[PDB]
Write a protein that binds this ligand. Structure first.
Ligand SMILES: *[C@@H]1O[C@H](CO)[C@@H](O[C@@H]2O[C@H](CO)[C@@H](O[C@@H]3O[C@H](CO)[C@@H](O)[C@H](O)[C@@H]3O)[C@H](O)[C@H]2NC(C)=O)[C@H](O)[C@H]1NC(C)=O
Ligand SMILES: *[C@@H]1O[C@H](CO)[C@@H](O[C@@H]2O[C@H](CO)[C@@H](O)[C@H](O)[C@H]2NC(C)=O)[C@H](O)[C@H]1NC(C)=O
Ligand SMILES: *[C@@H]1O[C@H](CO)[C@@H](O)[C@H](O)[C@H]1NC(C)=O
Ligand SMILES: *[C@@H]1O[C@H](CO)[C@@H](O)[C@H](O)[C@H]1NC(C)=O
Ligand SMILES: *[C@@H]1O[C@H](CO)[C@@H](O)[C@H](O)[C@H]1NC(C)=O
Length: 1938
């Protein structure tokens, strides 16, 4: 088919000529995705490496490990390499620290080396003899000549004075000449000590200790913390990495969009306590300084907090006595520190005054080897005297490290400071309360000062239950701020990451829940068993693989379809508007009649809507690739997906093309239907994806839903990279989901196909032009019988006929639109047998409506309409040139059809009506409405196309038929009357009009006996004379007589006229306002009850929106309710929990494993119904083994792999592409776990003798991928078993009896002494036993599960309890359960819940406002409908001033708004929506609802003036109101949430700026009501309560007052928006190129009501009986004068407006003067839907009262009881005009301005209307006519006037006016008549060829000479018949504006 090319070219021409929709459709979606590009740039993707978190020691695993662990893991570091904790045997990570390295260097060189054994003897020598001390050493010394003392054998002295030739003289005794033992070879462990101090352990002293030694505190606290970590922690890789857990999606609204988030109620200051009075100082310094205001707030409950137990029963006291294991040893530590107070005074006694200190001073000569000390300088740092060093520098003397100064003083100061700090602790934390209700109030009291840890309430035990049940159950009641919420157990939004923030998500560790829980369970276990065998807990979080968390992935999954829909919404609207407009102009019917099929039209529309769509999609894909938003998916499959979406939406537009007939309405409605069809994808995405049937084709019947599913799959793929590559486009992609991206696109294409097919099916049957439901396919033209018509080849055969009397059906049969067959209508020599071909190519037609496109130029209109049935384009140029030459419109070749003149449009349509060489042509009213000059132009065009064509024109103008062409054909409901020329059909007589009565009538009677005065009208006289056998006396002798006698008689005019064709055609066939507002109210009531698309659509749609809002708000559960969780591992779904059995050599560990995995099951599910009341436990115990995977799994791991990386790693490809999880290969973690077994529900894996980390971190991606199906609530099928076994590598070697060694050191001293040190040392072995635990167990927990670390503590402690008990009391009955029940919230805690609820309240308030705003939009639509379509100024002139009109419209608006308000309040009254139905709150709500309309309707009213389309105003107002309300509520709500100078602006806009808007007032009213209700509910169960009476006069009352004042001021504004006479003359001189003494007479001038001289200086007025016709050319449209005279509108004063309505000028009295001149409303102002009562409403404006007459007054009309009962919108073309002109004359007004009194009416009705007009002018009621048809202005206008170029030209009666500005027709050889017309008559004109029907016009008054030669001498000139007619008034009018 070739029509597709031309149709596509036409569509492209329209698209290019629009130039406004094309540019925006191409540019604006790019701008929309620029938002996505900006969001991608702003929101980055977080990428991070592998994590291996260290251990988290528990209080049951010693004090030292737990304390150093809580100090080390303050950040919970992420470590790439696995920590030593994950290893099977070793469990302590802190063996790389400086202290650990020092302790490893020691205990190796010194203790564990067989070198100190010898020195032990010297150490234990002591040799401290108490009796042989204290200056008691004297000996007799009787030895002589020898020593060991001094010889005493001499007569002079012994040793001193006898040192010369005598006895002993020196240390060695000698009588002749003067002169055990060695400890450790005089050196002991010298080289060992030197080596030990020369190790890297010097870094402990000379590198890191030196900053601490200098001053108290080296520098800022960060460096001190780092130094302490280096000493204690010693973590590798420096400071550990962090994940920062960037996920706020769990509440925390203040920190996301409210700016800075305020903390909790911070304490004021240290307001006294029982502490040291120094601890208060540091507490104040920490809780007031912002640096530590956060850390101390999270540390005060632990150091200074209380734990409360409810039962107070002896069992509870016994349990807690076994639970204070850590505190009873922290007290021991504190006592040990405090023992310094007594030790120090005795240690310092060794320097000031001590005998021991003197020994080293006295040992310098020979004791302790030689003079050198350290074995004669054994080491470089050794030796020196040491008597002037840190060893001693005298008891008191004045140096870098001399004496015990700089060591003892600093040590004492540090120890005293440590004792003071440690005294700032509370260890009697356990407080004994009862009944569990004092617990809650005391916790509430303590939480103000943060001195409250928790409360351990025990269910089901009375205060008198000394014994302990086999199943001991207990609860922990934490504060909700520092405990995980118990209402949600999962994150509810899976984000790739380990969820390991130090402070944001580990509320179970730093909050103290886990520590207290473990202490309580340890107490319970040790009370129920009491068999020692201590086993702690070393909770270790599961490793996490390297991940790339992209925060943008949340977007583009719920925002990409939003943007796509909002991007093609305007294209959808524009294309639907174009399609509907192509049918509204009745142009699709024209195309179908021309020959092109419907399928071709659909195909070309698809091509037009697809070319621009493809261009836009190409631009969008280029932008997306350039925007770096979809970087990995594909460059091309995205383009294919968008093309599929485009064709789907084009098919949907084709579907929505139906159900519509108006372009604007369809354009407005499609733009919202296309989004409503996209809503249920959002509905399924929001809390509905979990409930899926694996085949969403049923719900994806809408294309946007399919696009949403496809983009969801694209998002889910983009996380792993390669989103939509061809390799995995479909074939069960996305973790084996049945629904596929490829399948989704294919079914969307099928959806487009079915939409197109259904659109075809509907369009074949829905339009009213034609239909066929359920088709179930399986001499040129002449008519002998069809009745007898033979259209001649060169005649304009006017096919006249009455409406519905064969004038339409016969044409429809002949044109082939409805071929009846069985006839002899041989059109052009061809029959009906084949009318599709060779007929339409030469049967160009023209319907009544125009067939010109709005936007095509005339240079292309004829081109398209000639090539539609043409073949080539070269001939098309010649045809266009010929058509332009004929039409004479060559100058206006580039002007579009819309810009063409009104009269030129019809001329062009007739020109293109028959252009493809149409031999036979059909015309339907070629000149229905045109200017007479344009009528003559189009007639000249038609007469130039008669060379070979046989044009057939069916005109309702009988006057036009006689002048268009010969051979008229009138059909009188059957057959043919007479197919002859009008001259031969006129005589199927001659009426001469002569314009005193007695003198005028005397001439007619005297000179003729058959002369009769037909009508003696005013200023007229119509004389009737016979036509047949009239001789010469009655032919023109009267004209000779009238001309002979014309000076005496006035007349001044004369003429002869023939019989008009109109006759021939018919021959064949106050106290007034109260009664006006009532009428307007009745009209409104009738209109609103006779329209189901305006009343119900405005009282139900808001109700539906409010119901949807209520449904959305109700389903939201309360946010402030926190239930209690049983805290067992089965709270989640089916899961894998592993099982490592390490340290097999311990029988206790073997029995623990056996009673963990086999006998009582994994967990707590006892033999009785416990720990799982609703979870039954089955009996499977399969003990299976995984089958081999010989693909590569049984082979790749079958090679030799060392201890390192036993698995073949996996691809952490986060280098060039962000793949999030590594997506590890088939190797994964290696061989599968040896067994899978389940007892209750969970699969158990025996990870024994197998690497745990290499499996846990590597098989996790596979499990999560297999489990991730919705990404909302996904169970990763694993949370972490517990690894039985593991020894704490560091254990105190000394153990017990260390005090005995310490006592021996203090034995020879006062180092022993003091009451405090005895108390500290009496129970030291228990302290050392509890310092660390030898055998220990590890626990693995997945922190992504919220309640996992707690639950696995519970299962581990249950196992420990079941293992420690002896070989009796079977463990199947023994268990412990914890229940986390947080405390009830406080004011500040519930403030967040109040804000969260107020958010939903504001959302529902916005929905209610948007729903309620529709009614004012409907009122505006009605106002525009009755404004632009007239009937506005019609009611103005016929009614009271606009003030009362607007008042009654306001009253009706209130009446129609009250019902909707009642519906809304009645849908709120059900279910008690947010307690809006309360007796105190309901009046406020109903008042707000009622007053919102009163306040917003006056703002809706002015929108009528701005908007002219009565359909675009609805959307442009609803969207505007929605935007205003949303903006107002958002500004007034989100800004209300931190004193950052925005609160002043917020208050200003709340008080003065935004208070004006009623939408803001209603929003504030509902928001404040919701807040008040929430506060009342909060205070209800707190016992406070308050009144909070509505109408606060400052909170919600101000909104009501604002609405009340706004309604009045805006009504005044609407009234204001709706809100000269120099000289005049009575003289009339326009007749030749003095008062008012007549009825309905005017004596005034006139001036234009504009800035240009439109109508100035008009005539005076009209006589009582005078139908003054205000005619004129289209240049002077008379609108500027008609509007000024009546109807107001453009009735501005201008320069000199002085015209009056016969009683007063139209200055300051137009309203009073408007009661005399009812306009005829040439715009067909029947804008209502009232039947038989529309005239009842229009009959108002009665002088005093007509209520008893209005029934009969409506009866007087133009033949009532015909269409009166029919609906006003169901009237025919002329019926509405007849009704309008009947209304225009109801009160017999003196002056009537009948503008276009009839239009498109059959002559049978035009004659009746003219009869009514003459009847009403007979009495004296003047009328005014301005119709373009000269037939009406000649048969009705007694006087006539024509205005040209802005001024009138001529006046007077029609006959006298035509005389200043008589054609004889003869019917027969033109030889004798031509000679007679040139020999007898000197003047003549053309003879109109020799067609035997010639028309002769004489330019002279010698009518007498045309009688004898014409009638009497007819045979002399061979004339069969003759007739004389004067020139038509149309010639005179054309002559003026020629
Ligand atoms: C768990 O063990 C700790 C170990 O101390 C208990 O701590 C309590 O500590 C306070 C102060 O250190 C003791 O108060 C003292 O009472 C004596 C009189 O008995 C008085 O003379 C002192 O001046 C001081 O006020 C308190 O006695 C002590 N508790 C016990 C039971 O001895 C903690 O109470 C233990 N918890 C449980 C639940 O048993
Ligand atoms: C805090 O909330 C708890 C919820 O369990 C309240 O305890 C019960 O609250 C309900 C109301 O929903 C009452 O009907 C019960 O009587 C309460 N229990 C008891 C034993 O009285 C608790 O009262 C609340 N505390 C407050 C509001 O201070
Ligand atoms: C911890 O374990 C042993 C204990 O001596 C030793 O290899 C070293 O101190 C540490 N090993 C590490 C950190 O790999
Ligand atoms: C400790 O240091 C102080 C401060 O200089 C000093 O006065 C004192 O002598 C030193 N030695 C002591 C207190 O034994
Ligand atoms: C121990 O202290 C007491 C009193 O403080 C004192 O008398 C005694 O001498 C001291 N010990 C020695 C060895 O001096």
């Amino acid at each position: 088919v070739r029509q597709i090319q031309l149709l596509l070219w036409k569509n492209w021409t329209l698209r290019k000529r629009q130039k406004i929709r094309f540019v925006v459709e191409l540019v604006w979606p790019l701008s929309l995705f620029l938002v996505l590009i900006w969001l991608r740039n702003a929101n980055p993707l977080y990428s991070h490496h592998e994590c291996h978190f260290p251990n988290k020691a528990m209080p049951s695993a010693g004090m030292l490990p737990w304390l150093q662990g809580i100090f080390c893991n303050v950040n919970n570091p992420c470590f790439q390499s696995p920590t030593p904790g994950e290893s099977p045997g070793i469990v302590s990570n802190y063996n790389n620290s400086i202290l650990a390295r020092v302790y490893r260097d020691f205990q190796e060189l010194l203790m564990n080396a067989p070198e100190s054994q010898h020195l032990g003897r010297i150490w234990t020598e002591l040799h401290i003899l108490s009796q042989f001390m204290d200056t008691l050493r004297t000996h007799p010394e009787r030895i002589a000549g020898r020593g060991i003392k001094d010889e005493e054998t001499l007569t002079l002295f012994l040793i001193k004075n006898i040192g010369l030739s005598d006895s002993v003289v020196y240390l060695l005794i000698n009588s002749q000449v003067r002169p055990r033992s060695w400890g450790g070879i005089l050196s002991d462990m010298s080289p060992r000590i030197q080596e030990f101090i020369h190790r890297p352990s010097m870094q402990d002293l000379l590198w890191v200790t030196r900053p601490l030694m200098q001053n108290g505190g080296p520098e800022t606290f960060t460096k001190l913390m780092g130094i302490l970590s280096d000493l204690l922690c010693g973590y590798p890789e420096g400071g550990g990495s962090r994940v920062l857990s960037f996920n706020w999606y769990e509440d925390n609204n203040y920190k996301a969009f409210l700016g800075i988030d305020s903390t909790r109620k911070d304490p004021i200051y240290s307001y006294d306590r029982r502490t040291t009075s120094f601890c208060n100082a540091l507490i104040q310094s920490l809780e007031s300084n912002p640096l530590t205001k956060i850390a101390w707030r999270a540390a005060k409950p632990l150091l200074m907090g209380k734990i409360l137990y409810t039962p107070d029963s002896p069992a509870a006291r016994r349990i807690l006595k076994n639970a204070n294991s850590t505190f009873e040893e922290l007290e021991h530590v504190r006592k040990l520190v405090k023992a310094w107070e007594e030790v120090g005074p005795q240690i310092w006694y060794f320097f000031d005054n001590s005998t021991q200190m003197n020994m080293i001073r006295d040992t310098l000569g020979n004791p302790t080897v030689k003079d050198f000390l350290n074995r004669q300088l054994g080491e470089e740092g050794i030796t020196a005297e040491a008597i002037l060093n840190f060893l001693y520098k005298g008891p008191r003397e004045s140096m870098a490290n001399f004496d015990w100064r700089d060591i003892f003083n600093i040590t004492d100061r540090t120890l005293r400071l440590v004792n003071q700090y440690l005294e700032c602790l509370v260890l009697d934390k356990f407080e004994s309360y009862n009944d569990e209700t004092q617990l809650t109030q005391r916790a509430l009291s303590l939480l103000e000062e943060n001195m409250f840890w928790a409360g351990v309430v025990f269910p089901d035990m009375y205060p008198w239950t000394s014994s302990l049940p086999p199943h001991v159950k207990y609860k922990i009641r934490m504060d909700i701020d520092v405990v995980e919420k118990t209402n949600k157990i999962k994150d509810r939004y899976w984000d790739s990451g380990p969820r390991a923030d130090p402070v944001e998500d580990f509320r179970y560790i730093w909050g103290g829940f886990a520590y207290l829980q473990d202490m309580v369970e340890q107490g319970i276990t040790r009370s129920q068993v009491q068999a020692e065998a201590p086993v702690g807990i070393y909770l270790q979080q599961m490793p996490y693989p390297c991940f790339v968390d992209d925060s943008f992935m949340i977007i583009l999954n719920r925002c990409f379809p939003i943007f796509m829909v909002l991007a093609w919404i305007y294209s959808v609207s524009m294309t639907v508007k174009s399609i509907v407009l192509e049918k509204e102009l009745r142009l699709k019917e024209t195309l179908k009649n021309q020959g092109v099929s419907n399928a071709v039209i659909w195909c070309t529309w698809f091509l037009d809507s697809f070319s621009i769509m493809s261009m836009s999609i190409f631009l969008l894909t280029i932008f997306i690739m350039h925007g770096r938003i979809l970087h990995y998916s594909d460059p091309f499959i995205l383009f294919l997906f968008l093309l599929a979406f485009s064709t789907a939406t084009i098919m949907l537009c084709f579907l929505l093309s139906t159900f519509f007939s108006k372009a604007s309405l369809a354009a407005a409605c499609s733009g919202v239907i296309y989004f409503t069809l996209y809503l249920p994808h959002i509905l399924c995405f929001a809390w509905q994806d979990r409930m899926t049937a694996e085949l969403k084709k049923a719900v994806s019947l809408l294309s946007p839903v399919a696009f949403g599913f496809g983009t969801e799959y694209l998002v889910r793929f983009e996380e792993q990279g390669l989103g939509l590559q061809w390799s995995n486009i479909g074939n069960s992609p996305t973790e084996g989901d049945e629904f596929s991206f490829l399948l989704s696109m294919q079914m969307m294409l099928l959806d487009a196909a079915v939409y197109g097919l259904l659109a075809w099916y509907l369009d074949q049957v829905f339009p009213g032009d034609y239909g066929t439901p359920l088709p179930w396919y399986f001499v040129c033209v002449k008519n002998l019988v069809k009745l007898n018509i033979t259209f001649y080849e060169n005649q304009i055969t006017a096919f006249l006929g009455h409406n519905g009397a064969g004038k339409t059906t016969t044409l429809s049969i002949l044109t082939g639109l409805l071929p009846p067959t069985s006839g002899t209508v041989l059109v052009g020599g061809r029959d009906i047998e084949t009318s599709l071909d060779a007929v339409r190519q030469s049967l160009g037609m023209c319907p009544q409506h125009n067939i010109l496109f709005h936007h095509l130029t005339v240079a292309e209109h004829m081109l398209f309409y000639a090539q539609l049935k043409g073949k080539s384009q070269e001939e098309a140029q010649l045809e266009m040139e010929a058509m332009l030459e004929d039409t004479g419109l060559h100058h206006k070749r580039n002007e579009e059809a819309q810009d063409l003149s009104g009269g030129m449009q019809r001329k062009l349509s007739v020109a293109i009506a028959f252009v493809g060489d149409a031999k036979v042509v059909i015309l339907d009213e070629p000149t229905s409405g045109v200017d007479p000059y344009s009528r003559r132009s189009i007639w000249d065009l038609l007469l130039k196309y008669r060379s070979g064509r046989t044009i057939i024109m069916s005109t309702h103008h009988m006057d036009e038929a006689d002048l268009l062409g010969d051979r008229i054909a009138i059909i009188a409901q059957g057959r043919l009357y007479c197919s002859g020329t009008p001259l031969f059909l006129k005589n199927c007589g001659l009426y001469l009009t002569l314009v005193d009565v007695n003198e005028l009538m005397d001439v007619v009677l005297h000179h003729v006996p058959e002369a009769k005065l037909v009508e003696c009208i005013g200023q007229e006289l119509i004389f009737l004379l016979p036509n047949k056998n009239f001789k010469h006396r009655a032919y023109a002798s009267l004209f000779r007589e009238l001309e002979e006698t014309l000076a005496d008689l006035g007349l001044s005019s004369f003429g002869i006229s023939d019989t008009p064709l109109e006759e021939i055609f018919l021959k064949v066939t106050t106290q007034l306002v109260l009664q006006h507002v009532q009428a307007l109210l009745v009209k409104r009531f009738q209109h609103t009850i006779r329209s189901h698309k305006d009343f119900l659509a405005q009282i139900v749609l808001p109700a539906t929106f409010v119901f949807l809002a209520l449904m959305l708000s109700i389903v939201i559960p309360p946010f402030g309710e926190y239930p209690a969780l049983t805290l067992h591992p089965w709270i989640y779904g089916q899961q894998y929990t592993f099982f490592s059995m390490d340290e097999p050599g311990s029988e206790q560990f073997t029995v623990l494993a056996d009673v963990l995995l086999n006998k009582p099951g994994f967990g707590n599910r006892c033999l009785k119904e416990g720990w799982l009341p609703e979870y039954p436990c089955g009996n499977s115990t399969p003990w299976k083994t995984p089958s081999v995977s010989p693909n590569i799994t049984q082979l790749f791991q079958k090679q030799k792999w060392t201890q390192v990386n036993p698995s073949p790693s996996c691809r952490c490809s986060t280098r060039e592409k962000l793949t999030m999880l590594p997506e590890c290969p088939e190797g994964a973690g290696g061989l599968p776990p040896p067994q899978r077994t389940q007892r209750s529900t969970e699969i158990l894996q025996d990870l024994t003798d197998r690497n745990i980390s290499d499996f846990l971190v590597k098989t996790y991606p596979a499990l999560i991928r297999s489990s991730l199906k919705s990404k909302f609530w996904v169970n990763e099928q694993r949370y972490g078993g517990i690894s039985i076994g593991g020894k704490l590598p560091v254990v105190p070697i000394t153990g017990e009896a260390l005090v005995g060694f310490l006592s021996d050191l203090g034995r020879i001293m006062n180092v022993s002494g003091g009451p405090i040190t005895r108390e500290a040392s009496k129970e030291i072995p228990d302290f050392l036993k509890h310092l660390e635990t030898e055998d220990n167990i590890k626990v693995w927990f997945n922190n992504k599960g919220w309640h996992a670390l707690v639950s696995f503590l519970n299962v581990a402690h249950n196992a420990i309890l079941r293992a420690s008990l002896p070989k009796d009391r079977s463990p199947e009955e023994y268990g412990i359960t914890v229940i986390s029940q947080p405390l009830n919230l406080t004011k500040e805690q519930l403030s967040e819940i109040t804000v969260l609820t107020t958010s939903v309240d504001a959302v529902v308030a916005i929905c209610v406002i948007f729903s309620m705003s529709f009614v004012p939009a409907s009122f505006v639509l009605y106002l525009i409908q009755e404004r632009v379509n007239k009937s506005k100024h019609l009611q103005f002139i016929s009614g009271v001033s606009p003030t009362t009109y607007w008042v009654t419209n306001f009253l009706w608006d209130i009446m129609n708004y009250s019902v909707s308000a009642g519906l809304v309040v009645g849908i709120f009254i059900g279910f008690q929506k947010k307690a809006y139905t309360s007796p105190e709150n309901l009046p406020a709500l109903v008042a707000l609802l009622l007053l919102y309309g009163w306040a917003v309707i006056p703002m809706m009213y002015p929108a009528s003036f701005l908007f002219d389309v009565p359909s675009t105003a609805y959307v442009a107002l609803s969207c505007a109101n929605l935007f205003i309300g949303i903006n107002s509520s958002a500004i007034t709500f989100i800004l209300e949430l931190e004193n950052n100078r925005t609160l002043l602006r917020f208050n200003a806009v709340l008080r003065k700026l935004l208070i004006v808007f009623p939408h803001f007032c209603l929003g504030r009213g509902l928001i404040d009501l919701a807040l008040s209700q929430a506060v009342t509910d909060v205070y209800a169960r707190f016992g406070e309560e308050h009144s909070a009476n509505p109408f606060h006069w400052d909170l919600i009352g101000k909104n009501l007052f604002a609405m009340v004042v706004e309604g009045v001021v805006y009504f005044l504004l609407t009234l204001l928006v709706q809100r000269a006479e120099p000289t005049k003359e009575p003289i009339v001189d326009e007749d030749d190129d003095k008062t008012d003494i007549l009825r309905l007479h005017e004596l005034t001038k006139i001036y234009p009501g504009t800035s240009s001289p439109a109508v100035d200086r008009l005539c005076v007025g009209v006589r009582p009986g005078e139908c003054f016709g205000l005619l004129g050319v289209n240049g002077a449209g008379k609108t500027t004068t008609f509007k000024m005279l009546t109807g107001d509108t453009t009735v501005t004063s201008g320069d000199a407006t002085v015209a009056g309505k016969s009683i007063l000028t139209n200055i300051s009295e137009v309203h009073q003067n408007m009661g005399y001149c009812p306009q005829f409303d040439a715009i067909d102002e029947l804008l209502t839907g009232r039947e038989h009562l529309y005239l009842y409403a229009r009959l108002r404006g009665v002088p005093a009262e007509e209520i008893e007459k209005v029934a009969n007054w409506s009866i007087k009309s133009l033949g009532l009881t015909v269409y009166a009962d029919c609906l006003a919108g169901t009237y025919s073309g002329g019926n509405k005009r007849k009704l309008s002109t009947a209304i225009a004359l109801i009160g017999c007004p003196p002056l009537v301005l009948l503008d276009e009194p009839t239009t498109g009416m059959d002559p049978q009705a035009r004659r009746m209307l003219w009869n009514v007009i003459v009847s009403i002018i007979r009495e004296g009621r003047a009328v005014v006519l301005t119709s373009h048809s000269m037939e009406e202005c000649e048969a009705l206008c007694t006087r006539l006037a024509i205005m040209v170029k802005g001024a009138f030209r001529c006046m007077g009666t029609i006959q006298h006016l035509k005389s200043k500005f008589y054609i004889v027709t003869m019917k027969i050889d033109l030889n004798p008549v031509e000679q007679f017309f040139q020999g007898n008559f000197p003047g003549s004109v053309q003879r109109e060829r020799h067609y035997n029907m010639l028309q002769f016009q004489v330019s002279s008054s010698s009518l007498a000479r045309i009688f004898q030669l014409l009638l009497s001498h007819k045979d002399s000139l061979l004339i069969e018949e003759y007739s004389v007619t004067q020139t038509t008034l149309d010639q005179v009018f054309v002559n003026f504006a020629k």
